[PDB]
Every structure is written in C-alpha cells, then in structure tokens.
Structure 1
Amino acid sequence: IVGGYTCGANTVPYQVSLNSGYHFCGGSLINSQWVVSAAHCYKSGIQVRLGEDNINVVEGNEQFISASKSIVHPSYNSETYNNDIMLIKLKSAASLNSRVASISLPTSCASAGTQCLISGWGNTKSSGTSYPDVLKCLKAPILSDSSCKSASSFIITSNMFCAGYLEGGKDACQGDSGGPVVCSGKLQGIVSWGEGCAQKNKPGIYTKVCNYVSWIKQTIASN
C-alpha cells in the first residue's frame, strides 16, 4: 500500500497473510474455514496466518493454519488475469474472535464512486522498495470503467474494476495481491494487478467479487 496509513492492530480482522516461509500475498477470511484470495497468488505450501499485525513478531493474537485444499477459479487465465480468484480451505476451523473475523460476501455489486478500504503488507513506495511489517490501509473510490480504461489504456474485463486516484500517490502495490477491497461492509474486490504503483493514470485493478458469489457459495457448500 502506497500513500496509505497504519491500520492499527487487528482493526482489519478479516485480513490474512499467506505465508510460504515469508509473506507473499493477502487474503480474506470469509468463514471459519475458508479464505479467498487471487488466483495469481497460487502456490503449494501455503500457511494461512490470521490475527496478524506485525508479520515479523508474534504478538499474541495469531492463528497459523495450513491450507488443506486450494481451488483456483476454473476459468482463471494467467495471461489476462481474467477470473483472478482462488479459494483456500483451512486444515482446521479458525477460532473466530474479535481479532479473527470473517467478512461478508456481497449480495449485489458496488458502483463507481463508492469508497472502499484496501489493506495489505505490500510495498509502500511508488519508486523503489520498502516493505512494512504492520498492516497498511487505504481508502479509495471505485472508478467508472470508461474513465479508468480511457486514462490507463489498461485491458480489463467485466470481472475487474478500477479503484484509486488518477492523479497518483495512493494505490495498492506488490505484496498486496490477493488481499481485500471492502466497500459498505462487503468484500467487493481482491487485489489483482496494475502497472507500477501509485502512478498518474494507472489505478489499481481489482477482481470483481460480486461476479463470483454463486461459484464461491456452491464451491464451499460442496467441499
């Protein structure tokens, strides 16, 4: 997260860190035993870390649980990032509490102009590199598709939306991928891609979760 702020410990209790010896992506807890993240985060050896603030210090509120199964969307296209979404089932149910909490899936989609909260432990610099150890947060509005496409020349699908600030300075970044975009109390986006971070006319691209709620619900029900 670039141009954001320190969330404050466990203030985003649905935020997870995916760890394969180190933090490599974010994710969102959607019930006690399932996390949703981005397909492009897919790898073997995933341990889900819940209740994290400082990802380099055991602070007392963590739960580490290994993934038992990962399910990349059937239609994930790594070339275009279309359908950039993945479900991870935990080996055991997390014990839910105020610092480890699920976030509601949307029943309807969000619209241009709505403010969202984006969070993660990704890069905080627009040029160069600095990785924070505590969770960072950013408030950003959903942009209209046409305004985003016109400004950025990005090639995006109806399964994606743009959020952020065309002037630059505030954006998600490398290492935030897979993490939550929450708008009006619902998980509407997953940090998916962009070009650089926080550059003028290059806003963040986010997987449009509302297009996948049928798939998420049926998949969890069957597994």
Structure 2
Amino acid sequence: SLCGMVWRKGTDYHKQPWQAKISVIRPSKGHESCMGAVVSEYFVLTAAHCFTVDDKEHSIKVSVGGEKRDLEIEVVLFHPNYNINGKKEAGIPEFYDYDVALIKLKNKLKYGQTIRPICLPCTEGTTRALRLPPTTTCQQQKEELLPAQDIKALFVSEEEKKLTRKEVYIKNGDKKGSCERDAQYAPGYDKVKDISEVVTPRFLCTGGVSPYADPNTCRGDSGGPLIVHKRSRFIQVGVISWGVVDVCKNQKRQKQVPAHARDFHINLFQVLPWLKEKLQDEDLGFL
C-alpha cells in the first residue's frame, strides 16, 4: 500500500504505473475513449460521463499496465449526484457536476512495475507519501496539496500505448475567478446568464497562458487523474472532466482564445464522503 511511487529509467507505464486506458465498446463521435487511475487492487477511478447510463458494466473496456488484455468489470459506481441532463432547462446541454465514477474489478490487480496505485487525498497513504506527521488531518492535507495560489500539477495523455506527461497549473489563487469565468468560451455555455451555474464548487481549473503555457486536454483524457507531484511521490487531487477547447480536433480555436482555454477537473476533496464510503474496505486508511 505504498502509493504514488515508481517501482531503472524505464518508459511510459513504468513512469506512470497508475494510468488506466478505457475504450467505449460501441463508439461514436465524442464517446470513443477515456482514462482512469488505479486507486486500489479492485478499483479504477474515472469520470462518470465515460459510460452509457444503461448497462454501465458492459459499455467500456479497461486496461492497465499498457496490456492488450481487458479486465473483467464487476460493477460501476456513479457518484449519486451526477446527471448530464441536469440543467437542460437552463440551456446547459451537458452538466458535468459530480462527474466521477469507480470501476470495481472482479479480479484483484497484482501490483508490479507497470501497475501501481496512486495516492488519494485524506488517506494515511498520502500522509506517508508527503512525509507528514501522524497528527495530519484532512484539512492539513488540503493546505499542503491545494494552497491558495497557482499550483503546479500534471496530467497524462495516451496514444497507442505511448504516455505523455503534460504540466499544468491549477488556478487556486487570485486567478481562480477568471479561470472559472472562462467556461463561457466553451461551445454551448456562452448564452448562460450566470456561469457559476456550470462551474460548481466541485471543480478545479487549469489551462491558459499564465503563469505558463498550459497544454489542454482532449475528450479522450476524460477521467484521467490530475496529479500533484511532490518529492518523487504522486498524489491525485482531481479527475479530468471537461475542457473549453478540444485541441485534438480544434487547435485553431485555442489559437483564437489562448488566454481563456481552460480545463475543468472534479476536485477529489469535494467528493470525499462518497470516495470514503465506496472504498471503505480497500485498506486505504481514510482519515
């Protein structure tokens, strides 16, 4: 249960052993693939919108370690508050509030050099990972991980078993408001008279050109971990949920509005009661 560590100078899955690759079984435009994070021997954390609402369990395949093989999915647990149609009335055609889900594997993962768990917030694993005293509370972990500033973080993109680590900054200080307001640059979100209707307290915000030029996410990054890296340990603080510009299709638009091209991530500190409940038997030592 040594979480968030690399287990030589190897490649791809050796550097990011928690990454999980997800494919939609009956693909269409916008519903082709997603990412996830190994969080325990039986669980992969991802985004709820990666699944079909009906027969969730048979709607995706998931792989780890860069393997060809798909793992048997026993159950998919959606956060109970998630509803993509929740705000049609308000003219918001897709609502990503609470966009998290857990995949329960039928078989126990065997940890190795290419399959390892990432650390989750408010666990004893994260306390040990950050080398903090045993007096550490959930709130103190949040202060350590998400201070009120621009926070260096990272996420991972995959293509044909090739993983690419991209560095981003979480706008959690004086730029937070502006980060969130830029949701209005997303197609469909532009007519909505109050933007905090789309950007709820559940969301962290990355992207833009200040303080640095953050790379942006694509639809296929949905559900992958947003990670803070500290002294050789990796802690998940968010789940990639939605972006202002799909830069895998639409690099043109990002060059039009680069200062406002944001990505939005479900803040794991904001869904702790649910995480804690679903993962209570996983030996993660939730605080």
Question: TM-score over 0.5 for the alignment?
Answer: yes
Match of 1:115 among 137, 152, 160: 152
Match of 1:182 among 211, 214, 227: 227
Is the aligned partner of 1:9 residue 2:3?
no
Task: Provide the residue aligned with 1:207 in structure 2.
Answer: 266
Q: Write out per-residue CA displacement over residues 12-36 of structure 1, whole angstroms, 9 at most, x where no aligned residue.
A: 1100011344861100100011011
Q: Is the 8 A contact 2:216 2:243 kept in 1?
A: no
- Give runs of aligned pairs for residues 59-208 of structure 1, distance below 5 A: 64-78=70-84, 79-107=94-122, 108-109=141-142, 110-111=146-147, 112-121=149-158, 132-133=159-160, 134-144=162-172, 145-153=176-184, 155-166=198-209, 170-184=215-229, 185-197=234-246, 199=254, 200=258, 201-208=260-267
- Paired with 2:82 and 2:281, the residues of 1 have a C-alpha distance of 20
- Paired with 1:41 and 1:101, the residues of 2 have a C-alpha distance of 22
Identity %: 25
Q: Is the 8 A contact 2:43 2:102 kept in 1?
A: yes
Q: Counterpart of 2:12 in 1: which secondary structure?
A: coil
- Paired with 1:69 and 1:25, the residues of 2 have a C-alpha distance of 17
- Shift in CA distance, 62/161, structure 1 to aligned 2, threshold 3 Å: same
Point out the structure with max Rg over C-alpha.
2
Q: Is the 8 A contact 2:19 2:37 kept in 1?
A: yes
Which sits farther off after the overlay, 42-51 or 15-24? 15-24
- How much has 1:149 moved relative to structure 2? 2.4
Q: Is the 8 A contact 1:63 1:94 kept in 2?
A: no
- How much has 1:172 moved relative to structure 2? 1.1
Q: Is the 8 A contact 1:116 1:141 kept in 2?
A: yes
Q: Is the 8 A contact 1:178 1:190 kept in 2?
A: yes
Q: Is the 8 A contact 1:65 1:94 kept in 2?
A: no
Q: Write out per-residue CA displacement over residues 160-180 of structure 1, whole angstroms, 9 at most, x where no aligned residue.
A: 111123466611112010111
- Paired with 2:223 and 2:70, the residues of 1 have a C-alpha distance of 18
Q: Is the 8 A contact 1:42 1:86 kept in 2?
A: no
* TM, length-normalised to structure 1: 0.80
* TM, length-normalised to structure 2: 0.63
Q: Write out per-residue CA displacement over residues 69-93 of structure 1, whole angstroms, 9 at most, x where no aligned residue.
A: 0011000121321001001100101
Q: Write out per-residue CA displacement over residues 25-58 of structure 1, whole angstroms, 9 at most, x where no aligned residue.
A: 1001000110110011123323320101xxxxxx
- How much has 1:150 moved relative to structure 2? 3.6
- Paired with 1:103 and 1:146, the residues of 2 have a C-alpha distance of 29
- Paired with 2:155 and 2:109, the residues of 1 have a C-alpha distance of 23
AA in 2 matched with 1:32:
E
Q: Is the 8 A contact 1:105 1:213 kept in 2?
A: no
Match of 2:34 among 16, 25, 30: 25
Q: Counterpart of 1:214 in 2: which secondary structure?
A: helix
Q: Alignment RMSD, CA only?
A: 2.4
- Shift in CA distance, 169/158, structure 1 to aligned 2, threshold 3 Å: closer
Q: Which has the higher contact order (CA 8 A, sep 6+)?
A: 1
Q: Where do 5+ consecutive residues of structure 2 fail to align?
A: 1-9, 85-93, 123-140, 185-194, 248-253, 283-287
Q: How many residues align?
A: 199
Q: Is the 8 A contact 2:202 2:270 kept in 1?
A: yes
Q: Counterpart of 2:275 in 1: which secondary structure?
A: helix
Q: Is the 8 A contact 1:51 1:62 kept in 2?
A: no
Q: Where do 5+ consecutive residues of structure 1 fail to align?
A: 1-6, 53-60, 122-131
- Paired with 1:170 and 1:28, the residues of 2 have a C-alpha distance of 20
- Paired with 1:72 and 1:151, the residues of 2 have a C-alpha distance of 27
- Paired with 1:92 and 1:151, the residues of 2 have a C-alpha distance of 42
